[PDB]
Design a protein around this ligand. Structure first.
Ligand code: A1BVY
Ligand code: CL
Ligand code: CL
Lengths: 301, 301
């Protein structure tokens, strides 16, 4: 028993991280087979921050303008191209530690592991969720650009996030591995701000199911609710709408615990009105929204 | 910016994990140089566990009683002995992936990373503190015995923990890598309970520094206090005594923020007496005590 924010083992991603330099700028890159992937903003200088013309800046570069380094080894670049907001440096060696892998774009609510890295060297690993406003709440300092997010299901690494920038409220924005941004953001230093965030309702419900599995029952009640009345209440606390999709997805946890989805919704409505009155759930005094239904089954018996 | 609970990158340890079987029991082992380390309880039947004599059960075993699998490869056991509550299985092959390592014993209040494993295969990684009552709050299911805890300093892995059991309240107990238990526990099926736990004061203060550095400041105040006055409030609230050594360790952070420890104690005093007056600090409605000063300095600089 127990329940914790748990990241994937990071070893397979570790053997892929390198350092990319261009001009006076150093950040991280991702070395798979004979390609290194990194943010395209590595090629910008001082007055290329507001309105860069990336196609114009790239055509002016030669291969020897890019210094790639894996530990002590210097890799040698033999070609370059751009795909959306990601740069692809072709190199003369294939990475011997390349795992089985794939690129996947995730949706709001999904979780993944981040491997934070500086100068091509891993620093730590933690779990994040894609927020409804298309940002993540991470821990990134100067030099962390090019760090990646991933899942590992059944020995295959799925890459889903590459870090590009921090927004004014202290939250983080990036792309998939095909270089398309999550949300309406752009790789320019013009003023930009995230939309107001909301709580991920389906995830909170999954976590209440986890608490019941781990032996907590104090917050249940004898009521139920319609799906519509639930949504009218929950939106007044900045919770995301629960859909029939989400109801279907909680079917297995429902069946294991014998508490119907709409009964558990009634419990959530009550918690929102009352708070916790000194108690905790799985060691938390807030309602947690960064564990998916799939994360709950994986971690629990 | 941002602040997250973060494990060390786990790859140097992932390369050391194997499966060990004796009769019908399977669990995890640690393969370093030409030895495999695992809990001595692997040799026990259900009935043995009620009241085991390990001296006698062990002399009755031989090398071929133990099956050791690294991936799909059998390791041959050529010797066997016991050190305290850990079994040492000598094998014919040195681990080509052995990192630079040593065995260390940690103190209460110190943190470390856990690599949860099942049938010799790494499953997840998370951070824990050694509680004052010598348990940890982990997440473990059957088959997790022999999973290990560790820190990394430069290139050197310091191994500090091996998982042995779950207590009735859902918390976890284990040994160092020399087989000595943390806390007053024994490796048998008998009645055992965790002592009443206490809050780690110096860590709570570290986390208040992290909050301030990340722009959370509401809980600050004009006041200061004394070690003596504070300690008498702490004793009442089941907080550990704060010592002059703790005050010194927090030195870098006092400097960085301009808030002195005894100033921060006044803030903490009010929070214990009054409450959080609703709010949250770094996304928590609890006072968090599982981050050390080093953890905070590491992450934030
Ligand atoms: C704009 C956005 C992000 C960055 N950085 C990424 N890693 N360090 N800095 C630099 C300029
Ligand atoms: Cl998804
Ligand atoms: Cl309220």
């Amino acid at each position: 028993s127990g329940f914790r924010k748990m990241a994937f083992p990071s070893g397979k991603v570790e053997g892929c991280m390198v350092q990319v330099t261009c001009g006076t700028t150093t950040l991280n890159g991702l070395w798979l087979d004979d390609v290194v992937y990194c943010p395209r903003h590595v090629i910008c200088t001082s007055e290329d921050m507001l309105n860069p013309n990336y196609e114009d800046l790239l055509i002016r570069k030669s291969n020897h303008n890019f210094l790639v380094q894996a530990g002590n080894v210097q890799l040698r670049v033999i070609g370059h191209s751009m795909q959306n907001c990601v740069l692809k440096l072709k190199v003369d060696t294939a990475n011997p530690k390349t795992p089985k892998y794939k690129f996947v774009r995730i949706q709001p609510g999904q979780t993944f592991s981040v491997l934070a890295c500086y100068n091509g060297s891993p620093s730590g690993v933690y779990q994040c969720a894609m927020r409804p406003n298309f940002t993540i709440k991470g821990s990134f300092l100067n030099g962390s650009c090019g760090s990646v997010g991933f899942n590992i299901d059944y020995d295959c690494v799925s890459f889903c996030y590459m870090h590009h920038m921090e927004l004014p409220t202290g939250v983080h924005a990036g792309t998939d591995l095909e270089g398309n941004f999550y949300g309406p953001f752009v790789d320019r230093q013009t003023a930009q701000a995230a939309g107001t965030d909301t709580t991920i309702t389906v995830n909170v419900l999954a976590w209440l199911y986890a608490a019941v599995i781990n032996g907590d029952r104090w917050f249940l009640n004898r009521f139920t609710t319609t799906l519509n009345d639930f949504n009218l209440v929950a939106m007044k606390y900045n919770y995301e709408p629960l859909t029939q999709d989400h109801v279907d997805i909680l079917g297995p946890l429902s069946a294991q615990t014998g508490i119907a989805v709409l009964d558990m919704c009634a419990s959530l409505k009550e918690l929102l009105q009352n708070g916790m009155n000194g108690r905790t759930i799985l060691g938390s005094a807030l309602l947690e929204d960064e564990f998916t239904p799939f994360d709950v089954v994986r971690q629990c018996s």
